[PDB]
Amino acid sequence: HAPYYGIFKGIYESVRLPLYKAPESVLSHVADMKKQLFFLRSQLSSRSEAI
Amino acid sequence: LQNEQEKHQEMRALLEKQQEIYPHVLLRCLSLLRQAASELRLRAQSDIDRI
Amino acid sequence: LYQLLDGDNTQKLFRTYDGLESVAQKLSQDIASMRDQLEVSEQEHSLLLS
């Protein structure tokens, strides 16, 4: 019933963060996702070069 | 779980290395066979058989 | 959170919660899109090897 629950529920689902997780984990998780994106880009570039 | 994730990343790195080396080795084999077919069988040996 | 997702210090004068959810969805889509590209690239590579 908290005023911002509906909005943040939507944000958790968008970043694939489970609802049972502590709210303090949201920024760390998003940071890791960005890290993963960088890694995937690097892998794609390496593979494209190898091909 | 953390250990298995680290193992996964290591294995992935090894797999990528092997996928990089394997096509080059195939190309070297193909190059040798091409030499045997074009320079030895169609040219050198064919001339010998005729004479 | 908005700064972490948008990267661009573009001092947007007005940050909305709807905008925040959209930028978060984009990151997830970018990761999904990158994984799909990698998979395609892996198929291309596999075809070449075959």
From TrEMBL, chain A:
The lineage of its organism: Eukaryota, Metazoa, Chordata, Craniata, Vertebrata. It comes from the Eukaryota. It comes from Xenopus laevis. This is HAUS augmin-like complex subunit 5.
TrEMBL record, chain B:
It comes from the Eukaryota. This is HAUS augmin like complex subunit 4 L homeolog. The chain holds residues 203 to 253 of 353 of the full protein.
